[PDB]
Structure formats: structure tokens, C-alpha cells
Amino acid sequence: KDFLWPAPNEEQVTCLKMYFGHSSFKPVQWKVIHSVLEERRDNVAVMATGYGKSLCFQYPPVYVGKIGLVISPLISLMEDQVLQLKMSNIPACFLGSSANVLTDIKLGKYRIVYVTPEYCSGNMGLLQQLEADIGITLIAVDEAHCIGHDFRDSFRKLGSLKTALPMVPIVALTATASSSIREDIVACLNLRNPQITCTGFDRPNLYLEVRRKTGNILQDLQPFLVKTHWEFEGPTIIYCPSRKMTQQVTGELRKLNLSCGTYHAGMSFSTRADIHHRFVRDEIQCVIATMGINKADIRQVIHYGAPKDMESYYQEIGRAGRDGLQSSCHVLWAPADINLNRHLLTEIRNAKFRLYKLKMMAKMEKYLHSSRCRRQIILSHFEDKQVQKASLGIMGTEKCCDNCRSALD
Ligand SMILES: Nc1ncnc2c1ncn2[C@@H]1O[C@H](COP(=O)(O)OP(=O)(O)OP(O)(O)=S)[C@@H](O)[C@H]1O
Ligand SMILES: [Zn+2]
């Protein structure tokens, strides 16, 4: 149910507004936050993209004014989150093998402390000292940050956190309902009677289509344009596989006077914040991207070129129709696309990582070539086997996907 129990009190709701700008907690967020704060319980939160997984670990230490330890091997992503938190008046730091920051962590100056798994393995005694002196509200581990080609490959070394900090709850975030992966998480992290919550993975308001490329950027994108200078039907994100393609597509759209912005990891935090703000305010109609985009009313997502893998594809299309209204997500691809080029995978000498990447690429290729319901493929991929009635209602209809629509011809 979407009934929050117990109800967030006045101190909790005003804190949420002051530090995060939100007026209410979402149901799965609240289940996790409450369990961490009141029950001090480990949690495995299976959360679909765009739900609000980050609040699960950022809010509790901010509310009690203690430390949330966020463990990830993605150093540049953590450095960027420090800056997002800074803009909300939440002090955060990255702690690594950091003389001026460790002294300040011991003084209570930081709410969120980002560390790599490598750092944790060598400094358990230091983390025990922080828990004894200040208190650690929670430890957060995101399974998705293992994109090192496995949760075990990325976080194997964390099988000592729970033994060093037995009373500190761990919140493990995952973007898949796979029982095998949940078992891998519980076992690797030594979770004690964890609370398991899941959001479900369908987004019924997204029409899914896959179409082959025609041999020219403007020729491929022309069908998405409506007359006025021509423009898209609504706010649109175009995902490209490389910074070069992002600039090529941007250059072509600008020949048609489309209002565009680019969004990639080569840009600074401040330049990305400006594009995001302008897209949110509808001062630009299209963002061409290669670090998410949160906007309520994205009406169209286009992957210009085959996506990398099902997980990133799903996260990317998930930015669409966050308001619940009808949106469309189209993949324009060709077998020669760089994300299906087996050469760089075939170059890997190691047998294990060459097999993992080849398996991911094969799953993506099978989805692109499929004549089956695209929605069912996605739901099955994320092992969301208990399909919701809403999903059964959308599937098979003209608004589900291109294959469902052509079966109705
Ligand atoms: N309680 C809330 N109410 C309204 N918005 C929220 C709430 N919690 C989080 N959000 C927003 O939801 C968006 C998604 O949250 P994130 O924790 O960044 O999840 P994410 O799956 O990494 O998002 P994407 O998919 O990468 S855009 C962010 O803009 C949050 O600010
Ligand atoms: Zn379908």
C-alpha cells in the first residue's frame, strides 16, 4: 500500500523540505528510511530508476545529524554527488588514502562520507572509531555501481563491514528483482535479517519502439518533427553512444533551428546544472546526452544508436513520462553501431570479463531484433515475474510497443 506507516512526523517532513526540497516521502523511500532510523535494520531496496533511491541514504544522516557512509568504486560520481549536496547545504566529503578531511569527519562536519571499497578494507578500525565517537547512521552500497564486472567483483572486500560494525544498518540498493542477485548481495555483505522492499519495474505509459537507421541523421529524426522552424512534439532526450555522436546530432538539429543542449561527462558540474535547469524550465526542447536528468514531462526518448546494455537502456528510457502521461521511447539502430561492435570485446584477453560483456551485448542485440512484446522482454530481464494487472492491461495493445501494435494490424 501507499499508506505510510508510521506517519512521518513534523520534524521529519520539515527536514525533508529544508534539505531536499520535497513535500512528501515516497512509499518505498519511507519504508527504508523508517527501518534504518527506528529499527536500525539492514535493507535491500530493489528500486526502479527515477523512484528516488538516493534519499534512502542521504536523508537519515541529515535528519539525525550524524554520518552516512556511502561505499562506491566510482570516485568521479561520488565527487559530483558531494557538489549536488553542497548546493542543498548538506556537507559531504570524499574520504581516501585526505588529511584535512578525516580530522573534520571526526569533528562532526560531514553528514555524508563517500569512500571506495578498497579504502574500507584497509581502514575498518578507523570506521569503528567513527561509529564509537560520532555514530554511523547507515552504510549504503549500490549494486549498480559495479558497472570489475559483477557485484562480487566490485564489493567482495566488504564481507568484513558487518563484522566490524555489527549494529550499523546497511542499505543495499539494486536495480533488479533477480533472486540470485539479492542472494549474492545478502551473502557478500553479511546482511542480518534484511528488510526487502521492491518498487516493481513497469512504466506502462511508455510506448516502446525499435527501428533501423536509414543512413542519415536528419532523415532518421525527420519523422519526430512537427511544423511551426520545425520542432519535436514535446520535451525530448536523445541518447548517443559517444561524445562525438552527441556533437554530430546536436550540429544537425541546430541546422533545423531546434533548441538543443548537450549533456555529457566531459562537462563540468556547473555546465550540466545549467542545461538541466533550462530543460526543466522548457528553455530548451531537446537534450542530446552521452548523471541523470529529472524532468516530469519528457514526452520522447530516442536512443540514436544501439544502447550499451539492458540496464543502462532501462535507466535511460526511465527518464520519460515521470508524470504518468503517455510518452514514447524509440531506439534507432543499425548492426554496425559501436555498442554492438564485438571487436573491442573480442580484444579482451581475459575469458571471464570477455564472456560477461559478450553476454550483455547479446541480450541487447536479441531485444533489438525481437518480434516479441518489448515490455515483456524488459519485465522478464529484471526478473519482475509477478507482473502487475496494470502491465497485463497495457501489454498487447497499440500503446504497449511496436511489436504489439503490428500484431494488431
Ligand atoms: N520524496 C521525493 N519526492 C519527489 N522527488 C523525489 C523524492 N525523492 C527523490 N526525488 C527525486 O527523484 C529523482 C530520482 O532520484 P535519484 O535518487 O537520483 O534516482 P536515480 O534512479 O539515480 O534517478 P535517475 O533515474 O538517474 S534521473 C531525483 O531528482 C530526486 O531529487
Ligand atoms: Zn508490447
Residue numbers in the entry: 525 to 621, 624 to 673, 677 to 757, 760 to 821, 826 to 944
Give verbatim lines from the article.
The Werner syndrome RecQ helicase WRN was identified as a synthetic lethal target in cancer cells with microsatellite instability (MSI) by several genetic screens. WRN is a multifunctional enzyme with both helicase and exonuclease activities and has roles in various cellular processes that are crucial for the maintenance of genome stability, including DNA replication, transcription, DNA repair and telomere maintenance. Dissection of the helicase and exonuclease enzymatic activities of WRN using loss-of-function mutations showed that WRN dependency in vitro and in vivo in MSI cells is linked only to its helicase function. WRN dependence in MSI cells was linked to WRN helicase-mediated resolution of secondary DNA structures resulting from large-scale expansions of dinucleotide TA repeats that otherwise result in chromosome breakage.
While HRO761 and ATP analogues both bind at the D1–D2 interface with overlap in the D2 residues, the relative orientation is rotated by approximately 180° due to a conformational change of residues 728–732 (Thr-Gly-Phe-Asp-Arg), a flexible hinge between the D1 and D2 domains. An overlay of the D2 domains of ATPγS- and HRO761-bound WRN shows that the hydroxy pyrimidine moiety of HRO761 mimics the γ-phosphate of ATP and recapitulates coordination of the hydrolytic water by the catalytic residue Gln850. The domain rotation induced by HRO761 splits the ATP-binding site in two and displaces the Walker motif, resulting in mixed ATP competition through allosteric binding of HRO761. Validated WRN inhibitors (for example, covalent hits, ATPγS) were around sevenfold more potent in this assay compared with in the ATPase assay at ATP KM, whereas false positives (for example, compounds losing potency after repurification) were equipotent in all of the assays.
